[PDB]
Amino acid sequence: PQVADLKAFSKHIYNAYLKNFNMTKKKARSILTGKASHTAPFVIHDIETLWQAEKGLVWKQLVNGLPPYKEISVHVFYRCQCTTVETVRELTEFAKSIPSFSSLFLNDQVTLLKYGVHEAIFAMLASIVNKDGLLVANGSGFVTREFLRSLRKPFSDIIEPKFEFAVKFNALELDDSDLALFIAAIILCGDRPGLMNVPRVEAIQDTILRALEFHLQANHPDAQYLFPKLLQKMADLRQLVTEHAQMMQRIKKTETETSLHPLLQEIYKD
Ligand SMILES: CC(C)N(Cc1ccccc1OCCCCCC(=O)O)C(=O)c1ccc(-c2ccco2)cc1
Ligand SMILES: CCCCCCCO[C@@H]1O[C@H](CO)[C@@H](O)[C@H](O)[C@H]1O
Ligand SMILES: CCCCCCCO[C@@H]1O[C@H](CO)[C@@H](O)[C@H](O)[C@H]1O
């Protein structure tokens, strides 16, 4: 009985995911491998191709919108910020499409997103990443990892650890239906500081994890240890975000000319 109920639960979480996320891992890998399209992403690998992309790529955020121009490395950081805020919006709608999330009081919803979105972002990031770079502008562009490594500190350093995590994460070969459950488990996390109804969130988190575990038994029947492996990734994501926050703190202290989106400021506020 347990197994059958969880299967319907996982399907509703998967529908929430399909309804709300801009791009699926299925779509991303088809672009990154080159099978899908009559057109390939524009490759951004240096200043000239970045400039050409800003001139000719369609970006969710108009360039004129980004904070005033400062320099190549900050400009790139502003696009990272713009896409992060866009992904917070999507993750917020994903969570609200999960009834047990929407049944929580609104202040606990905020606490869960506050301390969960960056873990979920960096997990979902792996879907648009390969070892050579990542997709941008809805799959219109591909920014090489080498280019991002060429940016000056501290902007290059905040970027490379995410690639390291993503490449290892992609070798577990999760599909979008796995990720929907994995991301939901990250958001509904009973450990977040200042949660009001902890036992409620813990019970939801436990339900998602049981669903996840049964989900991988059907969808990945030959992958030994894959469920405990994903629990370790969820611990690894906390450490990745702790370091990310530390690096963001340094950027705030030493890059005083770089502006930070106020919503992200609220997230880091502690
Ligand atoms: C995660 C995801 C949303 N990113 C950002 C990203 C990817 C990998 C590593 C790090 C990183 O962001 C670190 C700074 C984040 C600050 C905000 C915060 O903490 O809230 C991207 O999709 C992205 C990457 C590169 C570009 C880009 C356009 C032009 C040339 O390059 C555009 C978007
Ligand atoms: C259900 C709507 C009514 C909600 C009223 C309760 C709001 O409490 C506030 O919730 C925030 C976490 O989200 C915390 O940051 C604040 O410290 C806390 O004071
Ligand atoms: C769109 C959902 C994601 C929002 C993430 C940002 C949360 O910021 C927090 O908002 C609370 C008010 O609700 C304040 O009480 C906290 O001091 C602040 O840290």
Swiss-Prot record:
Keyword terms of this UniProt record: Activator, DNA-binding, Metal-binding, Nucleus, Receptor, Transcription, Transcription regulation, Ubl conjugation, Zinc, Zinc-finger
First-listed, main subcellular location of the protein, grouped into a coarse class: nucleus
NR LBD domain ranges (all copies): 42-270
GO molecular function: DNA binding; DNA-binding transcription factor activity; DNA-binding transcription factor activity, RNA polymerase II-specific; DNA-binding transcription repressor activity, RNA polymerase II-specific; linoleic acid binding; lipid binding; NF-kappaB binding; nuclear receptor activity
Subcellular location: Nucleus
GO biological process, one term: cellular response to lipopolysaccharide
Gene Ontology CC annotations of this record: chromatin; nucleoplasm; nucleus
Post-translational modification summary for this protein: 'Lys-48'-linked polyubiquitinated; leading to proteasomal degradation. Deubiquitinated and stabilized by OTUD3.
Subunit structure comment from the entry: Heterodimer with the retinoid X receptor. Interacts (via domain NR LBD) with CRY1 and CRY2 in a ligand-dependent manner.
Family: Belongs to the nuclear hormone receptor family. NR1 subfamily.
Function summary: Ligand-activated transcription factor key mediator of energy metabolism in adipose tissues. Receptor that binds peroxisome proliferators such as hypolipidemic drugs and fatty acids. Has a preference for poly-unsaturated fatty acids, such as gamma-linoleic acid and eicosapentanoic acid. Once activated by a ligand, the receptor binds to promoter elements of target genes. Regulates the peroxisomal beta-oxidation pathway of fatty acids. Functions as transcription activator for the acyl-CoA oxidase gene. Decreases expression of NPC1L1 once activated by a ligand.
Protein name as it appears in the record: Peroxisome proliferator-activated receptor delta
Residues of the full protein shown: 170 to 439 of 441
